[PDB]
Amino acid sequence: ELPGVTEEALRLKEAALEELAAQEVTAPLVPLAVSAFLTSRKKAAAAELADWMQSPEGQASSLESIGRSLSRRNHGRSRAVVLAHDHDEAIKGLRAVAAGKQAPNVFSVDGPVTTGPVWVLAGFGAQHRKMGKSLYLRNEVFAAWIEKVDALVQDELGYSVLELILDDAQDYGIETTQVTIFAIQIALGELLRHHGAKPAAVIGQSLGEAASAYFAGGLSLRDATRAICSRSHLMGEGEAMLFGEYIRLMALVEYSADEIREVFSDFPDLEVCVYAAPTQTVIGGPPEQVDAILARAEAEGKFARKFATKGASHTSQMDPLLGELTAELQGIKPTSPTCGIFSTVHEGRYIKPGGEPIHDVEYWKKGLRHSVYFTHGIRNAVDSGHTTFLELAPNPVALMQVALTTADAGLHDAQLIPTLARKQDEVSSMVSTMAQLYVYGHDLDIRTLFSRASGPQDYANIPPTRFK
Ligand SMILES: [Cl-]
Ligand SMILES: [Cl-]
Ligand SMILES: [Cl-]
Ligand code: NA
C-alpha cells in the first residue's frame, strides 16, 4: 500500500501542535450571510440584524451561532456577507451593507455572476517558508489531502513533502517548490469541493499545470503526481549542476510581446518563458544579456525582477531533460476533461468539457520546453464571458497578473478571489474565499462553513431558528 506519514513528520507535527497550543487564541473570522430576492429587502434584513445584534439578547449570542442560523436561510438572488471577528465588526459591516457602502470585510452584489469560475493553477514565484503549515494543522480535510499527496510523492521520489511543510528550518528549492505547491493546490481545491465548490474551467501556469490537469479531470491524482514529480526532480538536478557559461537566468520584465519582438533584436539568446500579462513577460537567457535587458528596462522606467534560479524553464535549455521525462511518464492515462480547459501550453486555446484528452506525455514535454501563454488564456476566458478567477496558491501572485489582463480586456469589475497568502491567517483566508464564492452566486454550500449544532445554544434566536 501507500507509505504512511513518516515518523519525522509525526515528530514535527507534535512539536508544531505544542507551539500552536501555547499561543494566544485569536478570534476566528465568521461569515454572516444575508440575502433576499431584492436588494432593498437585503439591505433591510441587514439593518434589522444589526439592530438585534446591538440588543442585550443579540450581544449574548456568539457570532458563530448567529452565522450558523443565517446559513440556514434561503439564499436569494441579492446576497451579502459580513466577515467579522466580534459583534462590533459585524454590526459595522452590516451597517455598510444596509447603506450600500463598501468595506473591506463586506461583499454585496445585486445578483449572481452569470458564468462559472475559472480556477487558476499557477505557483511560479509564490512559495514561502511556512506555506500550508497553519492550514494543515487546523483543517482536517486539507490535512487529509496533504497526506494523500505526501504518500504519493513518497512513492514516486522517496521523501516526504509534509516534513518540509512542518519544519520551519527547511526552505524550498527548484524541485521541492513544485511538489509542495502541487500538494497545497490539490488540497486547497479538494477542500473547496468539500464545501460544494467546483470549477467551470481551469487555467494552468508553469508548475501549476499538473494540478490544473487533475482538477480538469484530465489526469488521475496519481498521474498528475507523476507529472509534477518527473519534471521537478529532473529540473532540480539539472539546475544544481549549472555553472559559468551554462547558467540561464529568468526575469520578469515590463515588456509586451510586441515590444519584446523589437527589444530582443539586441539580445540574440533571450527567449520568452511566460507571457504573464499584456505588458509583462518572463524572459530567460545568458546572465549578461538578461542583465542588459533589465538595465534597458530600468532606464525606460519599466519594472524588472530576477528569479532565484540558475536555469530557465520554458526555453531551449530544457531540451536535454525531455528524453528522460518521456521515459518517466510512460503509462500515464490522459482522460477526457470534466470541465473546460484554457491550455496555456497550447497557446491559450479552450478545450471543451467532454473533449478529447490533451494531457499525454507530449503535452508535458511541450509544456516544459515552450512558452506559457498565460495572458492569452485569461483573455480567451474574459472574451467568453468569464469574470470570476479563483487562484489556488500559497500566495496570489498570478491573480495580480490576471487583473492586468482583465482590465486590458475592458473588464474592470472582475471577481478575483485569492486563497492563501503569506502573513495572512490561512484559516481566515479560506473563509473569505468561500464567502466570496457564495456572494457571487457560485456553487458553495454555506451551511458547511459551520459545524453541526450539538444543542440549541448553537443557534441564535432569529429566523429561521427562532425558539418558540
Ligand atoms: Cl431546513
Ligand atoms: Cl429564509
Ligand atoms: Cl460537523
Ligand atoms: Na504581451
Curated annotation (Swiss-Prot):
4'-phosphopantetheine is transferred from CoA to specific serines of apo-Pks13 by PptT. The active site is at S206 (acyl-ester intermediate). Residues 118-439 are annotated as: Acyltransferase. Identified as a drug target. Fatty acyl-AMP loading is inhibited by thiophene (TP) compounds, which kill Mycobacterium tuberculosis. Overexpression of wild-type Pks13 results in TP resistance, and overexpression of the F79S mutant confers high resistance. Structure-guided methods identified a highly potent and very safe lead compound, TAM16, a benzofuran class inhibitor that targets the thioesterase activity. The thioesterase-like domain is inhibited by coumestan derivatives that possess excellent anti-tuberculosis activity against both the drug-susceptible and drug-resistant Mtb strains. Involved in the biosynthesis of mycolic acids. Forms, with FadD32, the initiation module of the mycolic condensation system. Synthesizes, in coupled reaction with FadD32, the biosynthetic precursors of mycolic acids, alpha-alkyl beta-ketoacids, via the condensation of two long chain fatty acid derivatives, a very long meromycoloyl-AMP and a shorter 2-carboxyacyl-CoA. The acyl chain of the acyl-AMP produced by FadD32 is specifically transferred onto the N-terminal ACP domain of Pks13, and then transferred onto the KS domain. Made of a minimal module holding ketosynthase (KS), acyltransferase (AT), and C-terminal acyl carrier protein (C-ACP) domains, and additional N-terminal ACP (N-ACP) and C-terminal thioesterase-like domains. This is Polyketide synthase Pks13.
